[PDB]
């Protein structure tokens, strides 16, 4: 009968597939591709979970900071996503893809140049990732009490973004884009352990750092006070992680210490990893909002939506909601002093919510969308491509003209 649309959120770490109308994706696979190490030999490849285990194949990660770097592989990564996993005849199903805000236009052009010419799709919509994550939260919210106005923090593996949304419209010229994400946290734990805990095989340092990050890590109120708690009372704060070697099948054990709070700290002290960035995320959010119009500053502080897998850290919003309320209650205090102290202005109600769906938040906002009829109007079309060309998909809301 009438067929639903295909939805694909190709992220740095993990890739989210499925068809519209559904609540959770049909597949969630790493954004990896295993190749051998002319003719039909370019088809000897595997992607996803079928790529890690392959011994005689080389695993490649074609996506960095949300952008694609090798379109020779991503054109092979997408022809298994369609013909193996989804099993879709692309000439029938429309498509919804996702980009980060700072995706170059030439990457949007080569995307559409691939889908429309190679795969011959009849439609395509390249949406912004974190914007779809806000529509998902509104379903958790009461019906009718939907807050169209909200701020979004979407941090995954590649890059972190702060995107305000006011009355449904995206304030694109105030977006910020922090390059710190779950890959920088992982390589920082992968560093601390190489210095202290030798005995981790080099092939299993990454596997060991994600495991520490996902399980043991957390967020601290103050940094230097945690170092003392780990030193003065070490039995309570130092955990232990037993792994398994893949060659000898013998166990290896380590002690998990300062890397429990030091990884996530780079959200707030990003000069730990990247010296080209110093501002915390608690301050990036204040500049995003204070650069927005004066009327939608209060509703944006009151709905700050954490999305992405690298916001699952324990006590992430509790500190962000606290670093802001310090910053917001002072600014109002200073104005009250310069004016003359005659009016005590109303305080601002900061609120940082962390909604139930994070591993497939962006996909869900793409499935709700694609299941509408409005999607089939804004979708660029095969006809429009033949006439106007691949520059039909050149523009994004982050810029004008």
């Amino acid at each position: 009968g009438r067929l639903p649309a295909c939805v694909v959120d190709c992220g740095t770490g993990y890739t989210k597939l499925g068809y519209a109308g559904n609540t959770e994706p049909q597949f969630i696979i790493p954004s990896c591709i295993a190749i051998k190490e002319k003719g039909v030999d370019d088809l000897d490849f595997f992607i996803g979970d079928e790529a890690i285990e392959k011994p005689t194949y080389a695993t490649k990660w074609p996506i960095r900071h949300g952008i694609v770097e090798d379109w020779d592989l991503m054109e092979r990564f997408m022809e298994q996503v369609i013909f193996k996993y989804l099993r879709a005849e692309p000439e029938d199903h429309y498509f919804l893809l996702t980009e980060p805000p700072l995706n170059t236009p030439e990457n949007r052009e080569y995307t559409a140049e691939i889908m429309f010419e190679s795969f011959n799709v009849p439609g395509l919509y390249i949406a912004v990732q974190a914007v779809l994550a806000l529509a998902a939260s509104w379903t958790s919210r009461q019906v009718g009490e939907r807050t169209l106005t909200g701020t979004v923090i979407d941090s995954g593996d590649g890059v972190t973004h702060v995107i305000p949304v006011a009355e449904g419209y995206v304030i694109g010229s105030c977006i910020k884009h922090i390059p710190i994400a779950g890959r920088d946290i992982t390589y920082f734990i992968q560093q601390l352990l190489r210095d202290r805990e030798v005995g981790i095989p080099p092939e299993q340092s990454l596997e060991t750092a994600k495991a520490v990050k996902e399980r043991y890590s957390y967020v601290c109120p103050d940094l230097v006070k945690e170092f003392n708690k780990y030193d003065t009372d070490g039995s309570k704060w130092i955990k232990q992680y037993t792994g398994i070697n893949a060659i000898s099948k013998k166990e290896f054990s380590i002690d998990v210490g300062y890397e429990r709070f030091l990884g996530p700290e780079i959200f707030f002290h990003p000069e730990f990893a990247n010296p080209d960035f110093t501002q915390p995320i608690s301050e990036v959010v204040d500049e995003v909002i204070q650069n927005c119009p004066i009327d939608v500053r209060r509703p944006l502080y009151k709905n700050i939506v954490l999305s992405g897998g690298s916001t699952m850290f324990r006590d992430f919003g509790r500190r962000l909601q606290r670093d802001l309320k310090r910053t917001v209650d002072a600014r109002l205090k200073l104005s009250e002093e310069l004016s003359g102290g005659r009016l005590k202005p109303k305080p601002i109600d900061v609120q940082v919510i962390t909604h139930h769906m994070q591993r497939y938040a962006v996909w869900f906002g793409g499935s709700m969308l694609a299941s509408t009829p409005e999607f089939y109007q804004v979708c660029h079309t095969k006809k429009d491509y033949e006439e106007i060309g691949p520059s039909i998909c050149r523009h994004n809301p982050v810029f004008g003209v």
Binding site: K38, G39, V40, E106, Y110
Partner: protein
């Protein structure tokens, strides 16, 4: 359908004639410095176009100027499978036009590829080597297509065997 040695000998001579260039500030906008062959605001600074051709299909067009040259080229496309492979090849050569400094991101209408050579390339790059790239292009492009036509045909056999073998 004439011969290849004289064709490249004519083109090579016309190019040396047209890469006699110098810097030139604009006289329609305050302090711009554009290639006049592209903007075409000052007719006096535009030399004549001259064409070279082995035949109806293959040809070259050198649109010169005081500070720019434009070298459009038409390649021979006997069959449809060669029209495709040449169209894609230029797209993948234009996409890297920031690395081919003498290249246009789109071709002139009626032609398959177009170069653009400013007075800053001759000052920086070796003028006589840029010509040798245009000439080397025009005699290798025919070989690099048939090598793909033969590579498509070889792939089509394996895709047939890997289906019929299972019967």
């Amino acid at each position: 359908t004439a011969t290849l040695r004289p064709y490249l000998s004519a083109v090579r001579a016309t190019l040396q004639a047209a890469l006699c260039l110098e810097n030139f500030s604009s006289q329609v906008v305050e302090r711009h410095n554009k290639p006049e062959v592209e903007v075409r605001s000052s007719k006096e600074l535009l030399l004549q176009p001259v064409t070279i051709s082995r035949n109806e299909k293959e040809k070259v067009l050198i649109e010169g100027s005081i500070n720019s040259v434009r070298v459009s080229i038409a390649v021979k496309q006997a069959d449809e499978i060669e029209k495709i492979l040449c169209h894609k090849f230029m797209r993948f050569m234009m996409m890297r036009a920031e690395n081919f400094f003498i290249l246009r991101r789109k071709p002139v209408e009626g032609y398959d590829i177009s170069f653009l050579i400013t007075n800053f390339h001759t000052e920086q790059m070796y003028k006589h080597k840029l010509v040798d790239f245009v000439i080397h292009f025009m005699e290798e492009i025919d070989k690099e297509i048939s090598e793909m036509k033969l590579s498509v045909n070889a792939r089509a056999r394996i895709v047939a065997e890997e289906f019929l073998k299972n019967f």
